[PDB]
Structure formats: structure tokens, C-alpha cells
């Protein structure tokens with residue numbers, strides 16, 4: 154319990170300050186460990202409440218300990234800011250913001266589960282902020298009580314967990330920081346049980362056995378970990394796990410640190426009442442009062458807390474190893490600062506100079522009980538902030554030249570953020586964490602306060618600006634459609650970054666910048682904008698139905714009358730030609746002569762075939778054609794309209810599963826009609842032509858084509874590797890890798906492989922890659938559309954079931970009428 158004066162005095166010696174947080178996978182004990190720290194060293198002031206965002210700890214080290222600190226120290230008192238970090242670990246920017254205001258981290262790892270993805274994710278983000286890590290292998294009690302594990306097994310488990318961790322560190326830590334790996338012998342690894350309240354470092358044991366083995370602890374802690382053995386027979390320390398005779402030697406870690414602990418557990422839990430007093434006496438543990446009566450776990454919990462208080466182990470690593478702001482801001486300055494590295498503000502950050510202009514980073518806005526008011530939480534990197542001080546509030550889009558996001562206003566009050574409470578203070582110098590009241594309106598989320606007109610903004614969060622996340626929206630009650638269509642308009646108008654359009658398959662699509670953005674949009678659309686139950690789902694992907702080769706044999710079909718017959722074959726239309734039709738070089742209404750000259754001279758077509766195209770389809774202009782190759786059919790001219798109409802019908806609804814055809818050419822080889830027009834009416838010939846077309850189609854090695862996106866991704870070099878990793882998992886294909894900004898990888902990504910892509914990409918690039926996608930072209934899947942188990946077939950079977958059609962695709966024989 155300190156007074157505002159004591160706190161302010163503590164905050165002057167930033168050399169003795171430690172800004173850090175606890176990194177842990179859910180359930181690994183992050184909470185009970187901080188409760189332990191708070192109960193042991195928490196600080197409290199000697200009716201407005203807030204959400205606990207940070208806690209202050211106080212610690213004193215012995216004069217000898219302080220000498221061991223490899224960094225500028227002023228006295229034996231230390232102020233530790235334990236900063237709260239979100240629990241969402243998706244490489245989110247909320248987490249990055251929280252870490253940004255810290256310099257060191259206490260990483261919690263489970264004895265049994267070891268390092269899990271969640272752990273790797275926050276640690277990776279932390280390393281990206283040049284944060285120094287220190288580890289605590291937690292839940293050790295489980296291995297002793299539940300699993301009955303042996304000393305060497307426990308050792309091995311510890312060593313493997315430490316290795317897993319230093320793999321992540323060696324991979325993502327900036328080489329400029331040197332070796333930021335963790336070493337038990339150097340005291341950067343603690344072992345214990347946050348629930349039982351005990352933990353230790355090799356250092357503490359070295360201190361305990363140094364003055365006992367007649368050796369300095371520097372020598373002792375190297376010997377208390379890894380391959381160091383003490384042969385009681387020779388009384389010597391060696392690095393060989395066997396003696397001269399070759400007999401097995403027990404590792405020093407097991408023999409001097411684990412065994413005493415193992416013996417305490419075994420004796421106390423088995424009620425060996427004549428073995429416990431001696432063991433406790435030897436370890437110099439003293440039970441007082443009612444404690445002398447405890448037994449079992451109760452006695453154990455109490456004995457271990459006295460023998461190795463947890464908080465003590467943790468505070469030791471924090472003070473001795475985690476960097477102070479002075480130490481850290483020296484190598485973190487440039488990243489933190491967007492401006493010039495030679496800039497006056499950057500230098501003030503490197504020096505953690507309290508007399509320079511203000512450079513205060515706003516980490517986030519915290520909820521208070523002061524009727525809808527949010528206090529700004531952050532860290533003073535340069536200068537000192539004062540109550541009633543005129544400062545310059547610069548949002549995420551501010552630039553020294555423009556007046557965007559700029560907001561000059563006085564800071565109403567500077568408060569200490571102590572748990573759920575606040576404490577008004579007059580000022581706060583560089584190196585400290587602090588809360589600002591009165592910044593609510595001008596800043597929401599991150600920002601940057603300065604007292605210099607030149608001041609550049611501190612590292613801002615990079616956010617997506619492309620509608621890469623999209624879903625299909627539909628009313629649960631058909632009659633509501635009008636409100637939905639209206640709601641989308643209202644939604645679009647209110648949000649610049651939101652996009653809505655109708656898909657090729659007839660679904661309303663709503664797309665957002667990121668998953669979160671899209672979620673707000675859908676919530677607002679459903680609740681306000683449209684105000685009606687909406688149904689959300691992955692947009693249906695549209696496909697095309699084409700042929701890979703000519704009909705293996707003439708297609709023959711007759712009319713209902715059985716009097717008329719059409720003979721035809723289908724063949725592929727070249728992509729360049731389909732494209733030419735789709736894009737305007739070859740047009741439905743152009744003069745057939747000039748068009749045929751182009752198709753023949755420039756595209757390899759036979760000019761007679763070209764001069765004889767009867768129509769394009771579907772809709773009279775699609776990339777499918779009917780060419781007349783008949784020789785002496787008498788009443789040909791009279792059935793033309795029926796044939797054309799049937800084609801518009803056939804190309805609009807393919808026989809594979811009802812999708813439109815594309816790149817399909819149909820050659821009419823011959824037609825036999827009835828002499829009297831009354832048996833050659835459209836009602837007779839339209840079905841014939843459609844039936845024959847479907848047959849020629851199916852006889853031409855049918856295939857479906859899928860939509861393919863052109864995806865453009867901006868990101869930093871070291872992250873590019875994740876891009877290729879994801880793409881390869883999604884039938885992707887790289888197109889171009891260009892560039893002294895970032896990189897930009899361009900690739901083709903099948904549309905049916907893009908649902909959730911944005912998520913898997915941030916996950917594979919540590920949230921550093923930013924996707925952009927636009928429809929590019931159609932691609933023919935080589936697999937059999939009629940084989941329910943091939944890639945194409947699965948897609949066809951899913952669409953058929955979804956539409957209530959029979960599963961089996963009718964084969965060509967179903968449309969062929971034998972002579």
C-alpha cells in the first residue's frame with residue numbers, strides 16, 4: 154500500500170521499472186499465477202471503477218542480487234506493471250496493441266501439454282514487438298501427484314519444453330537483439346505450481362547450495378542443469394552420465410533439486426509421520442502453530458509455500474532478466490516510431506527522455522463506470538504528460554502535413570490505472586504506463602499523443618481495405634425480401650468499406666474488409682437496416698458446363714412425333730475465341746461476313762463454318778455457337794427459329810447439373826423433317842434440338858469449369874513464405890512476386906477454395922498479409938463430372954442434392970434415339 158507520492162517517486166526511477174505481461178494458452182494457469190503475484194507484491198493506494206487493465210507490483214532485491222542485474226539500476230526497489238492482454242489469439246491487432254506497451258513477457262507453459270499453438274501465437278507476436286521472454290513451466294504438481302512421473306522423465310519433459318520454446322524464439326527474434334533464447338542455468342526458466350503456490354529457478358537453488366558446496370553460484374547454477382553429474386563416490390563433478398566402471402550417474406538437477414521435492418511429496422502424502430519432521434528440519438522448514446497438525450495435501454501445500462514461494466521465483470526473473478524501459482526503448486525505438494530514425498522524437502524514445510516533447514502511445518480505451526466514459530490507457534515513451542496539458546491527439550490516419558485525425562485538446566486528468574481503480578496524479582514521465590481521462594471523443598482504440606508539431610505517429614495498426622470477406626444473405630421469411638433489398642441500400646450508404654451485389658447464382662452478397670467488419674455489418678443489417686430475420690451462409694459458387702473434345706459419335710435424337718430427327722456433334726471452342734466473344738472482338742450482331750473473315754483469318758476457323766453460325770448462346774450472345782453444316786435439307790429455313798430457341802435453352806441449362814454451358818460448339822450435320830409443317834412445329838423441333846444438343850454434349854467428354862480469382866497480397870518478406878504455404882493447400886498457383894515498401898504476391902485462387910482463406914492467411918503470416926481478390930477467368934477441372942467421387946463429381950453431386958434432382962447424372966444414352 155503506497156501513497157500517490159510514493160508511487161510518483163517510484164515512477165521517477167524508470168531504470169527500476171518493468172513493463173510486462175503474462176503469455177499463456179487457455180487453462181495453463183495465467184490467472185492463478187497473477188493472483189499469486191498480486192497477493193505477494195500487489196500495490197494498493199494508501200467511486201469510479203474501471204475494467205482492470207493493468208496491475209502494479211512492488212519488489213525489493215538484496216544488494217547482492219541487484220549487482221547481478223545486467224542493466225542500469227538505481228537502488229533496490231522495483232515497480233512492475235503487469236499489463237493485461239486479451240485472450241483472443243488469432244494474431245489479432247488488439248493483442249499486438251497490448252504487447253506494444255510492454256518490454257518483457259512471462260510465458261507460461263504447461264508441464265504436460267507443453268507449448269501449444271496459442272502459446273506460440275502470442276509469443277510470436279511478442280517477439281515481433283521485440284519483447285524479451287522468460288518462461289515458467291507450470292502445473293508441475295500434476296506430474297508428481299497424478300502421473301507419478303520419475304525425476305529423469307520430468308527432467309526430459311522440462312528440457313523438451315524449453316527446446317520447443319527456443320525454436321520459436323530463434324525463428325522470430327530479431328538478430329540485432331542477440332541471443333534472446335531461454336536457459337534454465339541462466340535463471341530465465343522457473344518451474345512450479347501456480348495453484349499450490351510454489352515455484353523455483355535454478356538460481357535460487359544455486360544460492361542455496363553455493364555457500365554449502367564451497368562453490369560460487371555462477372558455477373553452481375551451471376552444474377544444476379543439463380549434463381552435470383556429481384559422483385558421490387569420487388566427490389567430483391563431471392559431464393559423463395556414467396563412471397569409470399560405466400555405471401549410471403544421476404543428473405545433478407535430479408539429485409539436488411528434484412529429489413528433495415520428490416521426497417517431501419512422498420513422505421507427506423503417505424503420512425510417514427516419523428520421516429517428515431527430519432526432512433523438514435534438514436531443509437530448514439518451520440511449521441508454526443496450527444500448521445504442526447496438518448497432514449496430507451494440506452500439509453504439503455503449506456510446506457511447499459514455505460520452502461519455495463512462487464511469487465519469489467517469478468519476481469526474480471522479472472527484475473533480473475526482463476528489460477526496463479530505458480534498456481528496451483533503446484532497441485525498440487525505430488519500430489515503435491513511424492517517423493525518421495534520426496528524428497528528434499525517435500531519439501527521445503531511444504533515450505526514454507522525460508524532458509523531450511511528448512510521445513504517448515494510446516494502447517486502448519478502457520470502460521469505466523463514469524456514465525459511458527472510456528479512459529485512454531497507454532504508455533509515455535517520451536516527455537512527461539501532465540493534467541490540464543495542451544496536447545496533440547493524432548488518430549490512425551494522421552500525417553504531419555495534413556489536418557486529418559488531428560485533435561488539439563487539454564488532458565483533463567492523468568490517472569494511475571490500478572486494477573479496477575484510478576488515482577489522479579499531476580504528471581507522469583517517460584517509461585511509465587498511465588491512464589488519460591478526457592480523450593474519449595477524439596480517440597477510439599489506438600492513437601498517439603504528442604506535444605510536437607513535427608511529431609510523427611507511432612506504429613499504427615495495418616488494416617484491410619478490400620472487401621475480401623463475403624457471405625450470402627437471405628430472409629428467413631420470403632415475404633421479407635423487400636426489407637432486405639432496402640436494408641442493403643441503407644447499409645451500403647452508411648459504410649464506405651461495405652459491399653453488396655447480386656451473385657451469378659442469384660444470391661445477395663455482403664462483403665466486408667475483415668471478418669469483424671463483416672460481422673458488425675451483418676448485425677446492423679439484420680437488426681436495424683433491414684430489421685428482419687436473416688439467414689447467413691457461404692455463397693454458392695457458379696460453374697460452367699463445357700466439352701473437352703468432339704462427340705465420340707454423331708448424336709441422334711428424334712422429336713416427340715418421332716417424325717423429325719437431328720444429327721449433330723459437339724466440339725470445344727478455343728478459350729481465345731470464347732474470350733473474344735465475351736469481351737467484344739467477336740459479336741452476335743456484327744456483319745456475319747466481316748466476322749467470319751476474322752474468325753477464319755485470325756482464329757483458324759473455316760470461313761464457311763463461320764459465315765454459317767446460326768446463333769450464340771445463351772441469351773443470344775454467350776460463348777457457345779451453333780454452326781450449320783447441312784447440305785440438302787428442304788425445309789431448313791423453317792426450323793431455324795426452333796433450332797436457335799432450343800440452343801438458347803440448352804446452353805442456358807447444361808445437362809450435367811443445370812449450369813450454363815461455355816466454350817461449346819455444335820455442328821448440325823443433318824436434319825430429316827416431315828413433309829408437312831404441321832408435324833415440324835417448334836413444339837416438335839425445339840425438344841429435338843435440345844435433346845440432340847444434350848446428347849452431343851455428353852458424347853463429347855463433358856467437363857465443368859470453375860471460377861478463379863486473381864489474388865493480390867501485400868506483406869513483408871519474411872511473411873511471404875506463409876502465402877505459398879496456404880496457396881499450396883488450396884489448389885492455388887503463384888503468378889508474380891514483385892516489390893522499398895513491402896512485397897506483393899499475385900496468384901490464382903479457385904473461388905470454391907476461398908471461403909475462410911483470409912483467416913488461414915493471417916494465421917500463416919502472423920497477421921501480416923493483406924489479401925485482395927477479383928474474378929479472373931474460368932478453369933476446366935480435368936476430373937469426371939459424372940463420377941460422384943472425383944473433384945468435379947463431388948461438386949456436381951452436392952449441387953444436384955441441393956436442388957432436389959436425382960443423384961445420378963443422366964448419361965448420353967438418355968438423349969440418344971437409335972435409328
Ligand SMILES: CO[C@H]1[C@@H](O)[C@H](O)[C@H](OC[C@@]23C[C@@H]4[C@H](C)CC[C@H]4[C@@]4(C=O)C[C@@H]2CC(C(C)C)[C@@]34C(=O)O)O[C@@H]1C
Pocket residue numbers: 620654655656657658662664692693694695696860861904926927928
Ligand atoms: C469488386 O468486388 C468484386 C470481387 O469481390 C470479386 O470479383 C467478386 O466476384 C464475384 C463472382 C463473379 C463471377 C462472374 C460474374 C462470373 C462467375 C462469378 C462468381 C460465381 O461463382 C465467381 C466470383 C465469386 C462469386 C460468388 C461466390 C459471390 C461470383 C458471382 O458473382 O456469383 O465480385 C465483386 C463485385
Ligand SMILES: Nc1nc2c(ncn2[C@@H]2O[C@H](COP(=O)(O)OP(=O)(O)O)[C@@H](O)[C@H]2O)c(=O)[nH]1
Pocket residue numbers: 177178179180181182183184185186291292293294295345346347348349
Ligand atoms: N494442477 C494444477 N492446476 C492448476 C494450476 N494453476 C491453475 N490450475 C487450474 O487450471 C484451471 C485454469 O486456471 P487459470 O488460472 O484460470 O488459467 P488461465 O485461464 O489460463 O489464466 C483452473 O481449474 C485452475 O484451478 C497448477 O499449478 N496446477
Ligand SMILES: [Mg+2]
Pocket residue numbers: 180182183184185
Ligand atoms: Mg485465466
